[PDB]
Each structure stands twice: as structure tokens, then as C-alpha cells.
Amino acid sequence: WXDTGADXDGXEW
Ligand SMILES: *C(=O)CCCCCCCCC
């Protein structure tokens, strides 16, 4: 996906 913590459309990672 891409993210890490706060924020997104599900989290975590
Ligand atoms: C989230 O990004 C997990 C999937 C791995 C990245 C795929 C992006 C396109 C690959 C060329």
C-alpha cells in the first residue's frame, strides 16, 4: 500500500 501510522483507509503498518 504505502502508509505507516496515522492516516489512511484502514491502517496500521
Ligand atoms: C503496497 O504498496 C504493497 C504492494 C507493493 C507495491 C506495488 C507497487 C507497484 C509495483 C511495481
Side-chain angles (χ1 to χ4, degrees):
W1 235 278
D3 157 59
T4 311
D7 206 57
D9 244 87
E12 319 333 287
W13 158 209

